[PDB]
């Protein structure tokens, strides 16, 4: 589920800033569902 | 280590399409975005495009998007059509970052290939006329030039050499350039000693591979 | 598309000079910029990736700094190998957008060319095309001007040059310029003169050749 969203963030045709944002803001949940 | 290695031909006519291909060696394919990329002496390096090294999922340049294929096929091609001049350019392939997550190293490429020539013109391969540039008769102690005028070939290249390769100091061998023939012309000059001319037989060795035509050209002092 | 732009275009060194090469870009790009070294018919090689981010093997000489719009590739104490052309890329949008390259050249003394000029041959003349030739042999800099003449009316817009790159062993450049004529024309006109205007030549050298004569 996150490997599977972090990999389609990764290709999408937005900037590499924008990447990292959302791929930050991704494993946020990840890591709150989880701690 | 990872290598690529480009594959295709390198002469397309106009309105046809280009087909390139790439293999990689290594064994690491699925993990990373792979690319394209042309580098033109009149628009400079052009990013073409890149691909998914797992999924095949592709973002292409938006000026190149309407005709532009990347796809697998260890191997990726690129597919161009509706060719013009413009897309006449040095092709490479090459290895951006990992696809698996976003990394810092996504966008630059790290690994390249070596590189494809792709001609893009409608004229037919023809070999080389190669003319004398004969030493002027007019003393010894001082410095003669002499060369080989190599005309109207197509496509590029050929190679010049000397004597066999045995003649290297001051030899220049020029870029071609391309004439409004639409066929190509250069001249590969040496510089000598006068007083050699007498004693000394200057031959240049013209190749042109994809015509198969090898040219040996004696240069000597007409007279007069 | 974001436009890369380097300055200089052109740039002189000797072995140990510390050399910078500026890239701007036309927007902002969350500092992710690229340099590549690329050296006459090779493919280019990674430098740095994340404006400071070394690529693995390249020699501690070359560091990037640089922020917003304005970036830096700089080498420290310059190297034999270091000669060569560089070039920025932006990689946060897309598509990946290139500066024109920035050559690193080497600096050496001013040399005045030796000219030679170069009559169509006889067997070009039966093809119906003549090519005359003209020579500036192990120059510097590179800045020359040729300029032919035939019956002293000025030649413009029918001569081609190319330059080879810079003497492995002098660093000098040579370079060829060929005026392009119809035989008739050629057969028509007497004098032929190639004239080389250069740095290292006090006043312009004009080399030339009448036809038929010797």
């Given at each position: 589920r996150l490997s599977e969203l972090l990999s389609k963030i990764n290709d999408m045709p937005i900037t590499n800033d924008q990447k990292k944002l959302m791929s930050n803001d991704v494993l946020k949940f990840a890591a709150e569902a989880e701690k | 280590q990872v290598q690529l290695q480009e594959s295709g031909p390198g002469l397309v006519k106009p309105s046809?399409?280009?087909?390139?291909?790439?293999?990689?060696?290594?064994?690491?394919?699925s993990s990373y975005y792979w690319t394209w990329i042309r580098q033109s002496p009149g628009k400079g390096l052009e990013w073409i495009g890149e691909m998914n090294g797992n999924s095949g999922y592709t973002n292409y340049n938006p000026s190149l998007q309407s005709r532009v294929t990347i796809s697998k096929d260890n191997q990726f091609s690129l597919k161009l059509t509706s060719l013009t001049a413009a897309d006449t350019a040095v092709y490479y392939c090459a290895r951006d970052a990992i696809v698996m997550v976003f990394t810092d190293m996504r966008g630059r490429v790290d690994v390249w290939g070596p590189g494809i020539l792709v001609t893009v013109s409608s004229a037919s391969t023809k070999g080389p006329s190669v003319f004398p540039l004969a030493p002027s008769s007019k003393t010894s102690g001082g410095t003669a030039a002499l060369g080989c005028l190599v005309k109207d070939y197509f496509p590029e290249p050929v190679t010049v050499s000397w004597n066999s390769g045995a003649l290297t100091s001051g030899?220049?061998?020029?870029?071609?350039?391309?004439?409004?023939?639409?066929?190509?012309?250069?001249?590969?000059?040496?510089?000598?000693?006068?007083?050699?001319?007498?004693?000394?037989?200057?031959?240049?060795?013209?190749n042109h591979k994809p015509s198969n035509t090898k040219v040996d050209k004696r240069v000597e002092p007409k007279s007069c | 598309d974001i436009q890369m732009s380097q300055s200089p275009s052109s740039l002189s060194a000797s072995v140990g000079d510390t050399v910078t090469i500026t890239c701007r870009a036309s927007q902002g790009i969350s500092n992710y910029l690229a340099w590549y070294q690329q050296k006459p018919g090779k493919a280019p090689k990674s430098l740095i990736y994340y404006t400071s981010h070394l690529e693995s093997g390249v020699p501690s000489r070359f560091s990037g700094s640089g922020?917003?719009?304005?970036?830096?590739?700089?080498?420290?104490?310059?190297?034999?190998?270091?000669?060569?052309?560089?070039?920025?890329?932006?990689?946060?949008?897309?598509?990946?957008?290139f500066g024109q390259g920035t050559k690193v050249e080497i600096k050496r003394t001013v040399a005045a060319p030796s000219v030679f000029i170069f009559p169509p041959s006889d067997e070009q003349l039966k093809s119906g095309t003549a090519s005359v030739?003209?020579?500036?042999?192990?120059?510097?800099?590179?800045?020359?001007?040729?300029?032919?003449?035939?019956?002293?009316?000025?030649?413009?817009?029918?001569?081609?040059?190319?330059?080879?790159?810079?003497?492995?062993?002098?660093?000098?450049?040579?370079?060829?310029?060929?005026?392009?004529?119809?035989?008739?024309?050629?057969?028509?006109?007497?004098?032929?003169?190639?004239?080389?205007?250069?740095?290292?030549?006090?006043?312009?050298?004009?080399?030339?050749?009448?036809?038929?004569?010797?």
């Amino acid at each position: 589920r996150l490997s599977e969203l972090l990999s389609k963030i990764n290709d999408m045709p937005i900037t590499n800033d924008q990447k990292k944002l959302m791929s930050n803001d991704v494993l946020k949940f990840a890591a709150e569902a989880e701690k | 280590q990872v290598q690529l290695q480009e594959s295709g031909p390198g002469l397309v006519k106009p309105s046809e399409t280009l087909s390139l291909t790439c293999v990689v060696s290594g064994g690491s394919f699925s993990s990373y975005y792979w690319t394209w990329i042309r580098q033109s002496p009149g628009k400079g390096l052009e990013w073409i495009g890149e691909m998914n090294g797992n999924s095949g999922y592709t973002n292409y340049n938006p000026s190149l998007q309407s005709r532009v294929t990347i796809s697998k096929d260890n191997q990726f091609s690129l597919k161009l059509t509706s060719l013009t001049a413009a897309d006449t350019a040095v092709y490479y392939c090459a290895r951006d970052a990992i696809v698996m997550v976003f990394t810092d190293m996504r966008g630059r490429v790290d690994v390249w290939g070596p590189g494809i020539l792709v001609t893009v013109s409608s004229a037919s391969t023809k070999g080389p006329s190669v003319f004398p540039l004969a030493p002027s008769s007019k003393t010894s102690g001082g410095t003669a030039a002499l060369g080989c005028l190599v005309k109207d070939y197509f496509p590029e290249p050929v190679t010049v050499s000397w004597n066999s390769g045995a003649l290297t100091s001051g030899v220049h061998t020029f870029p071609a350039v391309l004439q409004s023939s639409g066929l190509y012309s250069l001249s590969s000059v040496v510089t000598v000693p006068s007083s050699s001319l007498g004693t000394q037989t200057y031959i240049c060795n013209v190749n042109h591979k994809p015509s198969n035509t090898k040219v040996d050209k004696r240069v000597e002092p007409k007279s007069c | 598309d974001i436009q890369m732009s380097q300055s200089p275009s052109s740039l002189s060194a000797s072995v140990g000079d510390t050399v910078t090469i500026t890239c701007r870009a036309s927007q902002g790009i969350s500092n992710y910029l690229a340099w590549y070294q690329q050296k006459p018919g090779k493919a280019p090689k990674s430098l740095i990736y994340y404006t400071s981010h070394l690529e693995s093997g390249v020699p501690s000489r070359f560091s990037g700094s640089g922020s917003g719009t304005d970036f830096s590739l700089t080498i420290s104490s310059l190297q034999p190998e270091d000669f060569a052309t560089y070039y920025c890329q932006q990689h946060n949008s897309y598509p990946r957008t290139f500066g024109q390259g920035t050559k690193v050249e080497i600096k050496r003394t001013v040399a005045a060319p030796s000219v030679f000029i170069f009559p169509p041959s006889d067997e070009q003349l039966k093809s119906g095309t003549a090519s005359v030739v003209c020579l500036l042999n192990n120059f510097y800099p590179r800045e020359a001007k040729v300029q032919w003449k035939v019956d002293n009316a000025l030649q413009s817009g029918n001569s081609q040059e190319s330059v080879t790159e810079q003497d492995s062993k002098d660093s000098t450049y040579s370079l060829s310029s060929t005026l392009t004529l119809s035989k008739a024309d050629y057969e028509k006109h007497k004098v032929y003169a190639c004239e080389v205007t250069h740095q290292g030549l006090s006043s312009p050298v004009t080399k030339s050749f009448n036809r038929g004569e010797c």
